[PDB]
Design a protein around this ligand. Structure first.
Ligand SMILES: [Mg+2]
Ligand SMILES: [Mg+2]
Ligand SMILES: [Mg+2]
Ligand SMILES: [Mg+2]
Ligand SMILES: [Zn+2]
Lengths: 129, 206, 78, 102, 64, 150
RNA sequence: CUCUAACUAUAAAAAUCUCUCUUCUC
């Protein structure tokens, strides 16, 4: 316990436009919401790993500016009724937050899993791409 | 300095002490340095030659193309436009003139200058055709060192030719001034300008 | 196609005495000298570019480095 | 002609089974003809464990794994290569692909 | 801030791409003998070259 | 002698909206001149060209005509522009179309002024246009109030 | 004659088609 003031990065990684949003332990106080679509232009690449690194590096910079040094992780897919699977980008954001100075510990997944309700969007035959 | 009598009198500068092989009996490969640590082993300044034209089997194998003397690759790449595909003698004369020009402009023994120009103008990132049909995109890819050398040669010679086309200035001197611009970061050079453009397109499409 | 170049003579076909003064004091301050450069300074048309350059080899004003045709490469007496 | 003796359903004595939505295209399919994969993976990819390993508090952290089944409609199962279009005599082999690594 | 880094290729991981003209390799950095990373390369490479990477950590994947 | 850009600084800015005259197309789009700022060129890139899929490259560009534009990252060292055409909002195009025509008229007048006075445009915009743009936000409104108020 | 550990990541659009059908016996 060498005074690692803690944070929770709470990457929310969807199949498009992932999120990195570091807040206090209680989660009440936000620090650098800055997201995936913040730093990319295509709007198709919002989920791309490069968006993850860009968002992660800038939120890490803001993290050093404020003072937070150690971070716990709340990885979250879209969850609910949608696909239950972590977004492609968010993993790259995890890697970047690991790299850029920040100390990391206590990795957790908090994807909201339902207990079978709220009939999934799409109809019977479902998406028919 | 130690001349040898024979029945046939070899001239002064050819017979004197020339166990010190020079490019055109003028410029030495010694003191020539490779700045970037990568492209060493991809340029053959280690091998001294007396002319910039040695017709050897340098393309049958996968990688023997790298053993070619760099000056000869430059020569062989001067000849473009289709019509002037051959005529190496023309290319070697042009490159010899250009080496003399580089000897004029910034004495710096020209071979170092051309090597530095080659090193600088290499594009470290390229793009690739990846987008499938509908949502076409431009992927960013790293580049081979050997491909960097070959690309540098191609862009330099292309800039020289486009500078010389229907222009009072000659190919030898246009090549020389392009090499001078390319030794430094003189963006006036067409080659470095295209290298920058390619790098930027790759970067903006990471 | 259209003659949209908008180019004037852009050289000198017949010299001036003032032009001769220009070339005479001009051999200094131009360390690289070639017929191309001499035309480039709007002062020589090019037909007489070689004529003038060869004239500069009257007092050894500019020594040759390589006297091959198709060009001319010279450097001042120093 | 009956393509599969097991009728390709695996219901065989149940009348009717609750439906489950596909994971990609969300097509509802009986929970038995509902090709299904245990997607167990380390929360971090093995390619990036080392960066985590030497730059983290809590020396020798658990590095947990994420668990979930995936339920596909067979259309997705075929197109997304989860299930291949096997040959005739090779259809009646139900053993998984020889425990991919062993 | 020009972090031009150098990575010597230690192993070549096949050739990918729809064109088939790109090659993925595992490269170990010249400095920091510890780290290795997988990256794409355009143009021929063999075991021992030195890739000049502007960017370091953008580990690309198999490309279709 | 046409020069001396319309707004304060020579180089484009962050997320600014401009318009472009197009001249040339090599592979990745068109590095072509501006006529909202000085006369510099800029890259229009194909992945960021048009809303629909890029079916043809000749039709949508129209070499030698005026087109919408937005600059992403300004090369404030040498004079390069990374420029876009797709990501300009439908309401944003028309309001920039104004700004652009707004800028053009002042130059059209001060051109005539310079050509008849043979003073380079730079001095005229320095002396007249910039103080007007500072005082009234636009040299066009300054000209309109000049018509009314001396 | 002793055993049960790995893992990824695609889908844009493509409509139609005029004839002429002819033996096997040593
Ligand atoms: Mg289908
Ligand atoms: Mg019963
Ligand atoms: Mg089944
Ligand atoms: Mg019809
Ligand atoms: Zn499905």
């Amino acid at each position: 316990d060498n005074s690692q003031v803690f944070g929770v990065a709470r990457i929310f990684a969807s199949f498009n436009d992932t999120f990195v949003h570091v807040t206090d332990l209680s989660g009440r106080e936000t620090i650098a919401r800055v997201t995936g679509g913040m730093k990319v232009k295509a709007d198709r690449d919002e989920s791309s790993p490069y968006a993850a690194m860009l968002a992660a590096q800038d939120v890490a910079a803001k993290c050093k500016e404020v003072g937070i040094t150690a971070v716990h992780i709340k990885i979250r897919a879209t969850g609910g009724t949608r696909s239950k699977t972590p977004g492609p980008g968010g993993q790259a954001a995890l890697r970047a937050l690991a790299r850029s100075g920040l100390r990391i510990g206590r990795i957790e997944d908090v994807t909201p899993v339902p207990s079978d309700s709220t009939r999934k969007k799409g109809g019977r035959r479902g998406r028919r791409l | 300095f130690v001349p040898v009598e024979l029945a046939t009198t070899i001239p002064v500068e050819i017979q004197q002490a020339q166990q010190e092989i020079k490019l055109f009996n003028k410029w030495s490969f010694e003191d020539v340095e490779v700045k970037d640590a990568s492209l060493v082993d991809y340029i053959q300044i280690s091998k001294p030659i007396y002319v910039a034209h040695t017709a050897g089997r340098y393309a049958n194998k996968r990688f023997r193309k790298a053993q070619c003397p760099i000056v000869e690759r430059l020569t062989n790449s001067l000849m473009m436009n289709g019509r002037n595909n051959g005529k190496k003698l023309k290319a070697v004369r042009i490159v010899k003139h250009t080496l003399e020009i580089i000897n004029v402009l910034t004495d710096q023994n020209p071979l170092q200058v051309v090597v530095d120009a080659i090193i600088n103008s290499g594009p470290r990132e390229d793009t690739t055709r990846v987008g499938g049909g509908g949502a076409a995109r431009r992927q960013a890819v790293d580049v081979s060192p050997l491909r960097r050398v070959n690309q540098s040669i191609a862009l330099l010679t292309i800039g020289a030719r486009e500078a010389a086309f229907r222009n009072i200035k000659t190919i030898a001197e246009t090549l020389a001034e392009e090499l001078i611009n390319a030794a430094k970061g003189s963006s006036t050079s067409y080659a470095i300008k295209k290298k920058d453009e390619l790098e930027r397109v790759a970067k903006s499409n990471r | 196609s259209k003659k949209s170049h908008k180019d004037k003579a852009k050289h000198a076909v017949v010299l001036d005495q003032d032009k001769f003064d220009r070339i005479m004091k001009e051999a200094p301050t131009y360390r690289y000298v070639s017929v191309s450069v001499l035309v480039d300074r709007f002062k020589l048309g090019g037909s007489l570019a070689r004529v003038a350059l060869r004239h500069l080899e009257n007092e050894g004003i500019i020594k040759p480095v390589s006297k091959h045709s198709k060009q001319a490469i010279y450097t001042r007496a120093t | 002609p009956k393509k599969r003796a097991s009728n390709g359903r695996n219901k065989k004595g149940r009348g009717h089974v609750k439906p489950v939505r596909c994971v990609n295209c969300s097509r509802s399919v009986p929970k038995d003809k509902a090709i299904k994969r245990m997607a167990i993976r380390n929360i971090v990819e093995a390619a990036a464990i080392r960066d985590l390993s030497e730059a983290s508090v809590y020396a020798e952290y658990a590095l947990p794994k994420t668990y979930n089944k995936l339920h596909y409609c067979i259309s997705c199962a075929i197109h997304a290569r989860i299930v291949r279009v096997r040959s005739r005599t090779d259809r009646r082999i139900r053993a998984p692909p020889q425990r991919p690594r062993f | 801030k020009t972090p031009v880094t150098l990575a010597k290729v230690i192993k070549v991981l096949g050739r990918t791409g729809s064109r088939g003209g790109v090659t993925q390799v595992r490269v170990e950095f010249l400095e920091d003998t510890t780290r290795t990373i997988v990256r794409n390369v355009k143009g021929p490479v063999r075991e021992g070259d030195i890739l000049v990477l502007m960017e370091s950590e953008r580990e690309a994947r198999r490309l279709r | 002698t046409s020069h001396c850009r319309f707004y304060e600084n020579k180089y484009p800015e962050i997320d600014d909206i401009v318009m472009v005259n197009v001249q040339q197309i090599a592979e990745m789009g068109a590095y072509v001149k501006l006529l909202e700022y000085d006369n510099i060129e800029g890259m229009i890139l194909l992945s960021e060209l048009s809303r629909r899929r890029i079916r043809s490259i000749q039709k949508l560009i129209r070499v030698g005509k005026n087109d919408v534009a937005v600059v992403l990252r300004v090369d404030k060292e040498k004079g390069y522009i990374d420029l876009s055409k797709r990501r300009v909002s439908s309401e944003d195009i028309i309001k920039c179309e104004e700004k652009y025509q707004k800028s053009k008229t002042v130059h059209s007048i001060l051109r005539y002024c310079a050509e008849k006075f043979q003073i380079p445009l730079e001095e005229l915009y320095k002396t007249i246009a910039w103080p007007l743009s500072r005082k009234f936000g636009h040299a066009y409104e300054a000209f309109k109030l000049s018509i009314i108020d001396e």
